[PDB]
């Protein structure tokens, strides 16, 4: 009926169905994984290409928000770009008004508040993407996930996308206390390669980024010759 056409309407059981539909759109997107390794955060996403003529690096889903913070997008890429722009605005406001890098928890809370505001008004629709915030700020390594509903949660390891449950199960086999980013990059790449179906997504690429002590606490992409071939 008309109980699921706009976000400003609660259902008879207290649900917002448009947000659930946006989350369903997120659940049909490419798989992403992330791990907090007690010395940094490593995020790895799979990019599915519908053409073999795409230039390398096309449709980047991992974007640096600050020097030490970055966001991976799982879902509608343009919505993720808007969220990344908002996060970059939040990060530079802290560096300009308060003369300090934005803490990972603070940035995650700002992203969640921004995403939640689009689930309360009839004139807007919720974002169709989940945001993975990887930061190495003065509060240590931080890994957060922001839901299209606007709720944020901190994780040691997290998986999102179509092949989410199997990737989460593979992540359950790690220790996350002795785990280091150097081996975590390979672990996440191997998990993404193993969990991906090779007969439906012919063109696939693994895009991995990280921010730990080895990059001077700067959120950058991996060196090209570090991820496994497959």
């Amino acid at each position: 009926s008309g109980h699921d056409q706009s976000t400003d309407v609660f259902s008879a059981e207290g649900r917002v169905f448009q947000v659930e539909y946006a989350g369903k759109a997120v659940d049909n997107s490419s798989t992403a994984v992330a791990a907090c390794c007690k010395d940094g955060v490593v995020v790895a996403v799979e990019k599915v290409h519908t053409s073999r003529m795409l230039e390398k690096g096309s449709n980047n889903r991992i974007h640096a928000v600050d020097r030490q913070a970055g966001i991976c997008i799982c879902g509608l890429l343009p919505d993720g770009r808007a969220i990344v722009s908002r996060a970059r605005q939040e990060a530079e406001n802290s560096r300009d008004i308060f003369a300090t890098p934005i803490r990972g928890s603070v940035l995650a809370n700002r992203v969640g508040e921004f995403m939640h505001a689009y689930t309360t008004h009839f004139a807007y629709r919720p974002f169709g993407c989940s945001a993975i915030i990887a930061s190495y700020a003065d509060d240590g390594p931080q890994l957060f996930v922001s839901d299209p509903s606007g709720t944020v949660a901190g994780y040691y390891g997290v998986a999102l996308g179509k092949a989410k449950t199997v990737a989460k199960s593979e992540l359950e086999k790690l220790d996350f206390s002795s785990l280091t980013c150097d081996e975590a990059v390979g672990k996440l790449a191997s998990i993404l390669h193993e969990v991906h179906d090779k007969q439906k997504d012919k063109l696939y690429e693994v895009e991995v980024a990280w921010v730990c002590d080895k990059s001077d606490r700067k959120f950058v992409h991996v060196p090209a010759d570090m991820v496994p071939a497959e």
Binding site: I97, F98, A99, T100, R103, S105, V106, D138, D139
Partner: protein, 229 residues
């Protein structure tokens, strides 16, 4: 107005006079120019009282909300940046010289000077107010960096006393506050117990020989203090 802040190894000491003067009349002789921003961060205010009070209240309100938002403490650099921005956007309408001094667990004790122009300089020590002009050569000669907490407090009080001994716009009580990893501690010493004043200085006891008695000689023999003599 005489304000200053000096950094020691642990934290900072902020010192100020207590005198609000309407040109040549003392409107207030027990002012408090050390204004609390956070628990461990304070500011010394010089210039327009209303402008500095409004600036400090606005910055303190901004910082109090920021602590709740981030759930952690505030660095001295954040308060210095807040004053620098707010004083730079209003530099043509306000008359304010600010010293932002405090302690944070990350950078220890910090002192920042924000003059009337609106700049922000991180310094080991900062001076401000009309009476600061008397202290520069006092710091070049008598100040040695690396003093202890008590030594820093004593030196700050002595410097403030020397400053308002010569400055007519400064005087009254000397207020000091120490900000470090421990509990901040304040102190107010009165004028009659001040570490220095020219009234108690033995080298200014003898009066200048101006009122010569009528004499038959060019020899100078002191002032005439009696009608007969």
């Amino acid at each position: 107005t005489t304000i200053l802040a000096v950094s020691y190894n642990g934290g900072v000491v902020l010192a100020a006079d207590s005198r609000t003067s309407s040109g040549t009349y003392v409107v207030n002789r027990a002012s408090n120019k050390l204004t609390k921003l956070t628990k461990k961060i304070y500011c010394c205010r010089s210039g327009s009282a209303a402008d500095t009070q409004a600036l400090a209240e606005r910055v303190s309100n901004y910082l109090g909300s920021y602590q709740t938002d981030i759930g952690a403490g505030v660095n001295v650099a954040t308060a210095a940046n807040l004053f620098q921005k707010m004083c730079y956007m209003n530099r043509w309408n306000i008359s304010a010289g600010i010293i932002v001094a405090g302690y944070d667990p990350i950078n220890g004790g910090s002192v920042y000077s924000i003059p009337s122009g609106g700049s922000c300089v991180k310094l080991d020590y900062a001076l401000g107010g009309s009476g600061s002009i008397f202290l520069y050569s006092f710091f070049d000669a008598n100040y040695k960096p690396g003093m202890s907490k008590s030594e820093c407090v004593a030196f700050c009080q002595r410097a403030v006393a020397h400053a308002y001994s010569r400055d007519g716009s400064s005087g009254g009580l000397i207020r000091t506050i120490t900000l470090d990893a421990d509990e901040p501690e304040d102190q107010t010493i009165p004028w009659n117990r001040s570490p220095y004043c020219m009234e108690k200085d033995p080298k200014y006891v003898t009066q200048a020989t101006q009122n010569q008695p009528f004499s038959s000689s060019a020899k100078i023999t002191g002032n005439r203090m009696s009608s007969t003599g």
